[PDB]
């Protein structure tokens, strides 16, 4: 067996900038070898939940596609990534479905993300005419409407342009600090399964 | 708590432009909006200016457009405010307000002290 | 566009009367209308937001009711000392907020 080409985990955790939560990258990381003990085995990551497996077992049953997407998100509501719990940006930006079947990571990241003025960069919707379907981005700068009053471009009091900024602090609570969130999403394809473990 | 208080230039030069600097505290900045009114002497009161704090489009009134700019201002919570072709009738105090629920139908927020922005 | 007018004007009372200021626009707004003071020598602030909905801070005396598009300030203890000018202030889903004419209560 040896060793082959290993999955470029880093290249999804230690790049250098990370995409707003509104448009979230999508890795399509396949044919590769991942090792997860090492993820896994680490004092740096805050909060380590996975649904459907255990976090400890992963490491063999070969799966066909693995899905790699980050956020950087305020701390405080990083738990209502979890399946079916509601809230703000869950229900309107990011939402995974109840049958879920991955890994939520997250850690802090105080030292990079914010400055000393503050990084007001990211950027987090806040309206919708209703839900969002699972896994489906939400790239659009078309005011929402709201009331009834038709909206022809003008910001107005029923007028809302969807986006605002978190606002980072690097001296704010503990739960308004941003935190970076990876979500591994393995999806089994009637395929040859194509990313295994180490020792396999 | 929530409060704000203004700047006090009073002529930077006939024929050009002025700067007028609003900060507020007491209250989030980045989910309010902020607008400028005009009052003159004679106790006439127009509006001139409006910008929310989310993504920032400077829409006027018709009349005063091409001439007037309100810039964003994070620096701890503040507005900027400029207008070009100055005339012999801009004196006047210029008024700063701001809905801090702006997301909600409701309007709130104390006025500034007002910027006597005369010219000569 | 959006236009309204304040139609007292000008008020001549000292004590008790339920004083009335009414002013009505050109478009029937929601709810979306509030009213503004002004002390003759101080800035301006607030008094009601959202159609007579009180704010933290205001007295009692101070109150209002609508009709239609037709809106109504009312002060049921008026007083020789709550001298100022008034203003009904107008915004609805457009940037234009164009201002009344305003009126200043007098004794």
């Known amino acids: 067996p040896n060793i082959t080409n290993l999955c470029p985990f880093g290249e999804v955790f230690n790049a250098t900038r990370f995409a707003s939560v509104y448009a979230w990258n999508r890795k399509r990381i396949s044919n590769c070898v991942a090792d997860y003990s090492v993820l896994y085995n680490s004092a740096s990551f805050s909060t380590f939940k996975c649904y459907g497996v255990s976090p400890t077992k992963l490491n063999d049953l070969c799966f066909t596609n693995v899905y790699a997407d980050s956020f950087v998100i305020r701390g405080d509501e990083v738990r209502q990534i979890a399946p079916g719990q509601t809230g703000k940006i869950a229900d309107y930006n990011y939402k995974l479905p109840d049958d879920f079947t991955g890994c939520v990571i997250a850690w802090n990241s105080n030292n990079l993300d914010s400055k000393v003025g503050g990084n007001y960069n990211y950027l987090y919707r806040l309206f919708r005419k209703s839900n969002l379907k699972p896994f489906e981005r939400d790239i659009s700068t078309e005011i929402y409407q709201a009331g009834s009053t038709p909206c022809n471009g003008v910001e107005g009091f029923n007028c809302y342009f969807p986006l605002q900024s978190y606002g980072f602090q690097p001296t704010n609570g503990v739960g308004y600090q941003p935190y970076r969130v990876v979500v591994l999403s393995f999806e089994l394809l009637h395929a040859p399964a194509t990313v295994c473990g180490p020792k396999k | 708590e929530v409060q704000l208080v203004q700047s006090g230039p009073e002529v930077k030069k006939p024929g050009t432009s002025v700067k007028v600097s609003c900060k507020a505290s007491?209250?989030?900045?980045?989910?309010?909006?902020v607008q400028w009114v005009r009052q003159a002497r004679g106790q006439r009161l127009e509006w001139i200016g409006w910008?929310?704090?989310?993504?920032?489009?400077?829409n006027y009134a018709q009349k005063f457009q091409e001439r007037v700019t309100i810039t964003r201002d994070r620096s701890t919570s503040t507005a900027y405010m400029e207008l070009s072709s100055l005339t012999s009738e801009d004196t006047a105090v210029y008024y700063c307000?701001?809905?801090?629920?702006?997301?909600?139908?409701?309007?709130?927020?104390?006025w500034g002290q007002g910027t006597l922005v005369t010219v000569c | 566009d959006i236009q309204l007018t304040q139609s007292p004007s000008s008020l001549s009372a000292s004590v008790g009367d339920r004083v009335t200021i009414t002013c009505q626009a050109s478009?029937?707004?929601?709810?979306?209308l509030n009213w503004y003071q002004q002390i003759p020598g101080k800035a301006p602030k607030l008094l009601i937001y959202?159609?007579?909905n009180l704010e933290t801070g205001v007295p009692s005396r101070f109150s209002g009711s609508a009709s239609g598009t037709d809106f109504t300030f009312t002060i049921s203890s008026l007083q020789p000392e709550d001298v100022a000018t008034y203003y009904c202030?107008?915004?609805?889903?457009?940037?234009?907020?164009?201002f009344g004419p305003g009126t200043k209560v007098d004794i």
């Open positions: 307000a701001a809905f801090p629920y702006y997301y909600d139908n409701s309007g709130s927020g104390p």
């Open positions: 007491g209250f989030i900045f980045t989910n309010s909006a």
């Open positions: 910008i929310v704090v989310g993504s920032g489009n400077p």
């Open positions: 478009q029937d707004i929601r709810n979306n």
């Open positions: 959202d159609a007579s």
């Open positions: 202030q107008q915004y609805a889903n457009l940037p234009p907020f164009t």
